[PDB]
């Protein structure tokens with residue numbers, strides 16, 4: 001019992017972190033096999049970041065200009081290429097600590113762990129959700145670029161995110177491992193509109209199930225609702241419209257607890273309409289949306 | 305920018321996790337050098353846990369009864385001894401992955417990372433505080449015993465906690481690495497009184513400083529207070545009395561932001577007396593007490 005905002009164990013990802021230096025800019029790189037992946041903005045100076053011409057800036061760079069260090073070892077760079085907003089530096093040594101891994105593009109509403117790094121060194125790990133608007137509310141300072149987001153299925157690391165930018169709003173933006181930004185963002189120092197965000201409804205419901213499993217039950221009521229009725233409330237409160245695909249994914253939680261999904265929806269409706277009345281659910285005074293139904297099941301069963 | 309409940313990178317601790325089996329009980333052990341540390345209740349059966357006579361139960365066990373597995377390798381146990389509530393199993397092989405480490409007894413109010421494990425396998429990592437009453441509000445299921453709590457100072461892992469028990473209240477209790485329980489707890493299946501808990505005042509103040517550094521400033525007011533006046537409010541609201549030692553530790557945060565500690569105390573006083581008025585501070589709708597002033601400084605500067 002007990003429910004925590006748990007991150008995946010970061011060990012497998014720590015073994016992949018390197019420092020990449022180009023000119024006077026230093027950030028983090030991900031060394032998998034004989035390739036080091038890092039944000040392409042490692043090639044820019046302050047005078048360039050307003051609107052960098054990345055193709056031109058990269059042409060002034062040679063393999064020997066990318067200094068790659070894995071703590072005590074220097075990696076020999078034998079190739080460089082830009083793919084979207086990432087640089088792929090081919091090195092002459094395959095990382096001995098390369099885990100089994102996949103590069104995956106996650107969907108908005110999904111969660112992952114972030115290993116925050118500075119100068120190739122891991123500083124901490126936290127769990128977060130990809131917002132429906134494709135931003136993440138992380139904890140990143142200057143130098144944290146190149147830090148990655150991931151999920152782990154037993155022995156396989158699915159890398160889903162690489163940090164590139166802090167928007168003027170203090171929210172964060174980044175790419176998948178092919179360098180495609182999540183959301184409308186570009187790697188330029190310009191104010192950029194993040195879409196209207198919504199709360200991840202299926203996640204809040206998943207968390208309400210985690211609350212019931214773990215003893216917090218005060219929010220359960222004598223009511224039920226329909227997807228249509230619930231979706232009118234979700235609309236008023238800027239929540240994602242709930243679909244049958246969301247109800248289906250909550251099936252295991254609904255089955256374990258015996259609380260029908262639409263009955264939990266009626267508890268959620270009442271909390272949106274009345275608030276918490278100064279009470280808490282799993283140590284939180286608001287409706288948490290950073291746990292997917294998969295994360296709830298995994299945490300509640302003891303999956304390693 | 306951004307502030308998250310960050311855990312230390314778990315890599316160094318993952319390399320130490322083993323599975324310990326005795327009879328039909330399996331839990332986790334910590335393999336450091338040629339010793340494996342685990343909760344002594346690995347030697348009990350269900351018929352014993354009401355009031356185990358641990359000395360007698362251990363006398364029926366020989367080195368060969370403790371099965372220690374580090375994933376694919378079986379460790380050869382050449383000695384066993386009970387120290388307080390932990391067993392120390394001497395193995396014939398020093399762990400090649402042993403980090404530089406210390407065994408430390410933390411104080412109430414301090415924080416640490418927990419690497420939740422099942423059958424010697426890491427499942428997740430989260431940050432938590434040792435409550436002033438010596439319990440922790442973790443996320444532990446049956447099989448998680450032997451999971452450890454720790455802090456990391458660059459290359460050195462200070463192990464402070466080993467999980468032993470879930471109280472009937474769903475809160476958790478454990479020992480330091482010498483097997484001494486934090487708090488009044490005994491390793492028996494009996495209802496046990498956890499002391500009256502309080503909120504860790506210095507931590508809440510540290511978090512209010514993290515909020516100001518990161519943009520959340522709405523709670524700052526035109527007031528100030530004294531330790532005496534603030535302590536009357538802390539009394540009414542079950543907060544730890546603030547001392548000059550706490551004010552002193554907040555010095556770096558007070559210096560960086562230019563907000564005197566007693567001025568932040570007056571903001572805290574107003575939030576205790578008025579609540580949040582449906583607003584949030586760093587994504588939280590309550591006063592967070594799981595960040596020490598050290599954690600705030602480390603996260604806000606980028607320490608690896």
Ligand SMILES: Cc1ccncc1NC(=O)C[C@H](C)C(C)C
Pocket residue numbers: 041049140141142143144145164165166167186187188189305
């Ligand atoms: C300053 C900072 C703090 C946290 N995360 C990231 C950053 N860096 C940036 O946003 C600048 C970067 C070159 C983009 C314009 C592509």
Ligand SMILES: Cc1ccncc1NC(=O)C[C@H](C)C(C)C
Pocket residue numbers: 001345353444445446447448449468469470471490491492493
């Ligand atoms: C069931 C469980 C779930 C989470 N954490 C721990 C546990 N185990 C116990 O509390 C039983 C143990 C033998 C104590 C009586 C010493």
